[PDB]
Design a protein around this nucleic acid. Structure first.
Lengths: 124, 116, 283, 283, 283, 124, 124
DNA sequence: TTATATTAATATTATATTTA
């Protein structure tokens, strides 16, 4: 249940936010306010607002990732997502509004399915 | 009288207060609920001449009552006391004859039961 | 009453606010699902009209069939306590009560009113019928999650650190909603909807958004009210063929709308002059 | 009486509103269950025609079997107070009353009437026989929850701090209902339904939505009235083979419809020219 | 008289309407209950063929044994006021009356008629015997509750002025009824039912629904008339071994039908030509 | 009585809304207007309208969940549902209209059956 | 006289409508037009038509229920019914046509039998 | 022919997948 080549900017941004929070929640798993808890509200609606700051914020999570290769794992799928994101849309369309939540939970599943990211990375 | 009593006890049917219907309803007026509109065309061989034999002798009322009484029920679009009573007699005697196996005999009153 | 059938494209706009919250969708502005275009209900604009008339009239013959303490059966029973307490013979008692409404209540004279409820005061169709005002282009409902620095109740978290009940203030960052309205003399004559009442309605459309201001709907503006006045009780042109004369489109190169200046309202009165009169009350 | 058997596809849309309130068994737009296609009872359009004729003609020989104060047996027992007071010999008395209320009621001439109710006045077969208008594409009924700032009854639940009666405004965001209708000359012989009565009926189908407007039904229009005038009293070709001429489909790529511009009404009058006249009255 | 025996499959559908209301069941369409499949009495199609012949023929030798003021004993007694008033010797007076009622009344010549009633006119079986029309698939009778803004006798008039008698409109959202029929030659010899009367009947079957339209029928059509004309007066093949050649099924992937385009009518004329014709009169 | 793999977009959205309200009603059980009471009317008919906002609104409920692992429990089945939701449909089809209510009450049962979510999560 | 596990879609929808009107008639007992009076005609025949709207309309009745636990009582049996409803059928079959009225009055009895719902809920 | 006034109504569940 993840269309890795969907190209729906809402869906690719949802996927991107899912991996962003996956990294944040693997950077420090004990986290009061993940970017879902603090950024999702606009990441789903105003991707330009956060997703700029979400990637100020991303390399530092990739650093904080304990398993230094896991950082490559997750950064690679950030790039895989962002190939489909020619631009962070100013305001997510309403279709795209919902598809962002779709993407968040699709890509979150893809990340929490056991071998998926580590596998799918190894076919690149 | 044990055959006419059983005729007028199998024929017993509910009546309210000031019911225009007789306590024991006369056969010609009873059979008049089976007839087209007035009791002379009820078949003088399977009906008026055989209901009486099925009444004078406590025999089983012919199927031609369900058939005729039902015909009039859905043809007059109402069930006159006399069609309800006559069907109660038929079905009671069909039960009592083992011609209607599973069912149990009807009563005068509404059976706030009967699952049928 | 009125003798001309009117059909008005009432374009209004919401600048930053909830034009018409959807009770089915929180307080989100009613969207059209299939297109994302905002919807302002029939009754949102009808109620803005009512509230404006409540403001400006404050007299008999312009009562409003009214706000909060508005048990409608109370007003309807008030109608049955009139010149028709018992002299109107239940058949036409409801008709006489209906006429008393369609005299007293500018609400009911202008918009209908289902009054079959109390001591039945009839069933008014009301001449002026505004359609669901659908926004011209998809409203980008902005779902502004606001904070409140005080909890409402002693809820499950009115705890140590602070009392907060954030909630959301849904705002359309801009939407030029396009109501369609039809004023049929055939139902004015039934409700005594007068030409003066119609001018009250026009002033109401053009000024109801200067007065029903809310934190919810922010700034809302009657951005154009193009009324087609047919000559006849019957219509010179089909209502829709008239409403296509007021075509509203995003301007030259605006990807999205943040003002009315992003909207080009092209009226087309080139041929409606058959006997009609396009008259631009609001724009 | 008319002498040519008309079979007409009457396409009418609802831009945003409740086309035919709905089954009354429910009140969300009358749907065909399986397809989700909206239905509009033939009687709904017949009522739009009736209201149009009632407002337009306002004439004897065009009365209607009218609205609320419409005890029909009053209007039927009124027919037994004419040349056929009683001298018409009950057998043909009902036929003379039937002819009288055909002549008098454009309703009855055009659409039938079960007049066998009061002083029995025959039944009229109603030359004009609209069918259930079923939308071309599944109407995606929006069911807009609205509110009222006023409770109706002074019930127990008209509570302290606010009187609200939320209520629901079901609406078809758009649906192009298709009303196959048949005008039978054989049954226009029995009513005197005239070529002028039929021109009134066409004028009604075209213009009756511009006048029967309502809060519930929103904006609703006669998108097309493609009549097939058979050359003779009989059927010049089977009716459905003619209604297949007016093939209405969603446009090329519109997944869902929002307006008549989302509907190719393809119409081929190629071979009906045999003896049919495809009179595209409404569009 | 005809010298071939015919067995026809007459597929006719109803799109949105009551093909044949069951008076036993309100007016909701006749239904084979334990299979839900709709029914249309043979007398219903015989009636619409009667209506068609009464419509088109308008001449003696094709009367219909007829409409409401159709006291049948009046027509029967007309038979006994003929060349056979006395000259036919009561025994065969009824037979000469049969020959008459068959000559005059196409109803009687084609279908039978129980005319043993008045001045006894005999008892015609009728060469044409339509069967009941069991719809191919369970008709999903919709039972569209409708409204009337009018009432009948001022006994059901409202205690207020708001008269209305909602009532109910049962419609089959689609049913492809399949009527097997038998033109029996042996009784065509009795009634004089000729190949001219039979061609009249085929026209009537094809065109009996283009003309018998109601608010009840909505839209019924004659989706096919496959007539198996046997070589003999006898049957070349068993009738049902023929009717199984017209296999009508719901198409591949339709959950339940909504138009004739949902039924595949496969006609198997492969081997019936043993001595025998299949003419696809209607489809 | 829950087809977890139904794929009927109405049914998966009903399930999704059921878990969304389960989280809201476990976030703060004392709640005047749950998302059933304020969002269901359109979530059942116009999923794009709310379900975008329902998931602005979701991570905050997951935060407010007292049992921090219960948040993972419910978010996991949100993802399980959303694998079957390739997009929040603009307007729910009429079949899907009803199947949304079906999903709401099927998934609500699945959540209020005692061990079901905690079990079914542990087989993932 | 209630087969709570009948699975006959007409019967389960009749039960569902019975509880729906029970909630409506406990939401505001003084009610001019209950959903029996306004929806039953099609709920019995076209369940997709209403039963979507009947459950837009349901959470609001559950809110209006004065006894907030009674709302749980009735919602629970709505879910118990809807386990047996894999879909609101487009048009109720004729057998199912009648079984809907059967269900309405069976479940209405079950609700108006004194302790039945409060009991039967407590065995869940 | 008759008859013709409201049953029932108080909480289900609820503790972390993935991470070379």
């Amino acid at each position: 249940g993840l269309d890795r080549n969907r190209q729906d900017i809402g869906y690719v941004l949802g996927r991107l936010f899912a991996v962003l929070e996956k990294i944040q929640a693997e950077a420090n798993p004990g986290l009061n306010a993940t970017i879902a808890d603090r950024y999702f509200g606009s990441a789903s609606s105003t991707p330009i607002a956060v997703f700029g700051t979400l990637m100020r914020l991303l390399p530092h999570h990739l650093n904080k990732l304990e398993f230094e290769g896991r950082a490559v794992q997750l950064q690679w799928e950030i790039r895989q997502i962002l190939e489909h994101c020619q631009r962070f849309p100013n305001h997510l369309n309403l279709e795209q509004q919902g598809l962002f939540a779709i993407g968040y939970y699709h890509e979150t599943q893809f990340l929490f399915t056991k071998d998926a990211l580590k596998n799918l990375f190894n076919e690149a | 009288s044990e055959s006419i009593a059983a005729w007028y006890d199998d024929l017993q049917m509910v009546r309210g207060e000031n019911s225009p219907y007789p306590e024991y309803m006369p056969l010609p007026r009873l059979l008049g609920n089976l007839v087209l509109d007035g009791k002379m065309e009820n078949l003088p061989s399977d009906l008026i001449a055989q209901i009486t034999d099925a009444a004078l002798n406590n025999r089983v009322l012919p199927v031609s009552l369900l058939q005729a009484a039902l015909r009039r029920n859905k043809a007059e679009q109402k069930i006159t006391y006399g069609r309800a009573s006559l069907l109660k007699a038929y079905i009671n005697r069909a039960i009592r004859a083992g011609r209607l196996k599973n069912m149990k005999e009807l009563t005068m009153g509404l059976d706030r039961n009967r699952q049928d | 009453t009125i003798e001309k059938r009117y059909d008005f494209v009432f374009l209004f706009d919401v600048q930053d606010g909830n034009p018409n919250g959807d009770p089915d969708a929180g307080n989100l502005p009613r969207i059209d699902p299939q297109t994302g275009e905002g919807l302002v209900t029939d009754v949102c604009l009808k109620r803005k009209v009512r509230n404006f008339i409540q403001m400006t009239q404050n007299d008999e013959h312009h009562d409003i069939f009214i706000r909060e303490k508005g048990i409608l059966n109370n007003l309807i029973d008030e109608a049955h306590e009139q010149e028709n307490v018992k002299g109107k013979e239940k058949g036409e008692k409801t008709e006489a009560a209906r006429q008393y409404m369609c005299s007293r209540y500018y609400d009911i004279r202008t918009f209908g009113a289902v009054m079959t409820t109390g001591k039945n005061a009839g069933q008014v169709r009301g001449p002026v019928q505004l359609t669901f005002s659908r926004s011209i282009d998809p409203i980008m409902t902005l779902e502004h999650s606001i904070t409140r620095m005080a909890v409402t109740n002693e809820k499950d978290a009115s705890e140590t650190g602070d009392n907060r009940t954030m909630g959301r203030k849904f705002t359309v960052p801009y939407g030029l909603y396009r109501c369609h309205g039809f004023i049929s003399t055939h139902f004015a004559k039934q409700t005594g909807f007068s030409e003066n009442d119609l001018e009250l309605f026009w002033q109401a459309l053009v000024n109801m958004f200067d007065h029903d201001h809310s934190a919810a709907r922010g700034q809302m503006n009657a951005r154009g009210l193009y009324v087609f006045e047919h000559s006849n009780n019957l219509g010179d042109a089909p209502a829709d063929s008239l409403f296509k004369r007021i075509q509203v489109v995003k301007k030259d190169g605006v990807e999205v709308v943040r003002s009315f200046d992003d909207y080009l309202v092209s009226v087309d009165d080139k041929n409606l002059e058959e006997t009609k009169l396009l008259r631009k009350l609001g724009g």
